[model samples]
Target: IVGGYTCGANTVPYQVSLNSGYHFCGGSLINSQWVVSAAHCYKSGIQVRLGEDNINVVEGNEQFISASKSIVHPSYNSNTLNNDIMLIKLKSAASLNSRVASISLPTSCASAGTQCLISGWGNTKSSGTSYPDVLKCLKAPILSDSSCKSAYPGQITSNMFCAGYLEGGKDSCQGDSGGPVVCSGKLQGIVSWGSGCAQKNKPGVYTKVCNYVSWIKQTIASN
Candidate 1:
């Protein structure tokens, strides 16, 4: 999908499922058995549906199945919103179906000012209503660790990555919490926090995926 603003057309590339109607944000598949997302999404028994525009639209060839076992990071705290990353264990390994494909996980952290993409079923504009059926996405640049530390000061942690327009007024929020942040087509972060949906001078914070590679590997191996 090329980037655009037409509800599920622009961003929010993947859709995950929880029960019948409940849905969550997730990134493309990685290694057929793993689906990456934010740890805050650690609700039990969720499934992932990928390679589609409308999550609820149910267009043929859009729906693919992967039952997930929750693998929330141990240090994740919704209160402090720390550790913010997770992986979904697919019960059935996904075939490299052309429509629904897995995205690669990054081996290292993205550099400061690196351009990246964030997509979810989050509010299009701050204070706006959530899009019902379509996924939404947007582009942002990664911020330097120093810049992020200076911006959030006491709140920024080594486990998190800061991103968005430095000038402000654009970010991921609310429903976007567990969504992926892709840079150069590699998964680098998971949307985690901000003062609100797109606040100026306050960039959105995400869980640094690169930093958690060992944890992720071990967790997946044990489970």
Candidate 2:
């Protein structure tokens, strides 16, 4: 919830809480045994919790899965945050149920102004000191690469794009890194990085999933 709003329980089954001893980031289940996220979020002791909305409470459908492997894109640039995507191979495949499902990856690029949604347990605000108990969601409008470049000169690369409000008030914040950005029911982006949470003209930056489809498939196949 970018603006401190909570999403319905189990509304986003594919949304996974990436826990590094604690909830540190978010991810999307791309398949029964694979989760997609931002490369920058990679860290040791990482595990994924699925089928749960609230991280504090143990739900009936919750599954705490361990990662067999964490594959960060070889071209990922930590300084520039380019190619900021990764895939987590689960030690075991997740069982499908009412509260656990996988999201579809994008077959095409999202167009400018495409209405998308991002959900996570990140900070409610940029200055926030704590995270929400329940998952939060917010609507973000896609901005063209050209417009994004104007706001973040020389930073908006072809592998990345922008989404959020120019006037502020809504966006993915700290702790929401690696969360999914869904447009038209498809996984279009991953919450990569941003200047600040929901700042005016500083839209949330994301790793364009469409641009990495080939790499993703290749990685999954080889792994």
Against the true structure, what is each candidate's TM-score?
0.86, 0.97
| Candidate 1 structure quality by residue, lDDT tens digits, 110-215 | 8988998877766666665554456666788899989898888799888887988767667776666667788998888887778766666788998888888788
Per-structure clash totals for the candidates: 7, 2
Misplaced by over 4 Å in model 1 are 1-4, 7-20, 64-68
Lowest lDDT sum, 10 consecutive residues, model 1, at: 1-10
Report the CA-based lDDT of candidate 2 relative to the real structure. 0.89
Q: What C-alpha lDDT do the candidate models reach, one value each? A: 0.69, 0.89
Clashes of 1: 7
lDDT of 2 at 71: 92
